[PDB]
Ligand binder design. Structure first.
Ligand SMILES: *S(=O)(=O)c1ccc(CCN)cc1
Length: 186
């Protein structure tokens, strides 16, 4: 099947959301949150393995997939259709931004503050961008877009999408750099 940002993937007892399709030389996969699974973790739908994961400290990872699935430059818009990712030009503080994830679909907000530190129960994570968008469990790893420009993957936050909350993302460019990944674009 097509790898599409915002769609679910599974491992053991858990669900996270695909971030962005990526390539590493001849290999393919998708960016995600580090906390979704440590290096070597097997995943299903799509079949893959966590090829890299830095969490805590950062919250960045990627999953290498198999020939049974195909990378796309697409993100699920959760209204029947998709958004095409054309690059990863970083949006400014104050910009609108939207995220996609398997539990709450498409949700939007504003980028409030960058380089934020959050003391998660598993350990402290730095370098995060705080937004006013909401998220819920299952949405983690999912992509953030300002227009057609990739911003990050969902790391954490508080509250929910019924009553609202705040949400943190791991910026995408540090993730691509750390793991030596190329973003799949259209
Ligand atoms: S995960 O990083 O999308 C995530 C986001 C938000 C929550 C809200 C829990 N209070 C949980 C998991």
């Amino acid at each position: 099947a097509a790898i599409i940002g915002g769609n679910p993937y599974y491992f053991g007892n858990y669900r996270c959301s695909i971030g962005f399709s990526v390539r590493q030389g001849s290999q393919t996969g998708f960016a995600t949150a580090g906390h979704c699974g440590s290096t070597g973790t097997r995943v299903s739908s799509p079949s893959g393995t966590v090829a890299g994961s830095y969490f805590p400290g950062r919250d960045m990872g990627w999953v290498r997939i198999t020939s049974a699935d195909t990378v796309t430059p697409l993100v699920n818009r959760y209204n029947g259709g998709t958004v095409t990712v054309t690059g990863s030009q970083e949006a400014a503080t104050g910009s609108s931004v939207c995220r996609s994830g398997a539990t709450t679909g498409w949700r939007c907000g504003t980028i409030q503050s960058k380089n934020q530190t959050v003391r998660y129960a598993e350990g402290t994570v730095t370098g995060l961008t705080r937004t006013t968008a909401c998220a819920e469990g299952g949405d983690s790893g999912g992509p953030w877009l300002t227009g057609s420009q990739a911003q990050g993957v969902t790391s954490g936050g508080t509250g929910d999408c019924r009553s609202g909350g705040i949400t943190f993302f791991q910026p995408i460019n540090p993730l691509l750099s750390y793991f030596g990944l190329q973003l799949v674009t259209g």
